[PDB]
Amino acid sequence: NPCLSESDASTRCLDENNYDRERCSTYFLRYKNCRRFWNSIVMQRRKNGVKPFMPTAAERDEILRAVGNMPY
């Protein structure tokens, strides 16, 4: 599952500067951290095997509240 916050801001960076995808590598790193976090939540829901595992908007909200910071 993608991280559209780091997707838009990395595209804005790369557009500003020479398509310098390696000098904005930190955004793609925070995107892989975001992928790993939400894949962790998917696996922590999949232990019961019964709901849609990819968290819905109010789950993403209450879970971000329960981290108390950005997982990115």
Short account of what is shown:
It is classed as unknown function. This protein is an all-alpha fold and 72 residues long. The protein has helices spanning 4-16, 25-46, 57-67.
Shape: elongated
* End-to-end CA span: 13 Å
Biggest β-sheet: count, sense, barrel?
none
Treating each run of at least 4 consecutive H or I residues as one helix, how many helices? 3
The helical percent reads 55-70%
The domain tally reads 1
Count the beta strands: 0
Structural class: mainly alpha
Overall radius of gyration: 15 Å
- Element string (H = helix, E = strand): HHH
PDB class: unknown function
Keywords: CHCH domain, mitochondrial import, alpha-hairpin, Mia40-dependent disulfide relay system, unknown function
Assembly: monomeric
Entry title: Solution structure of CHCHD7
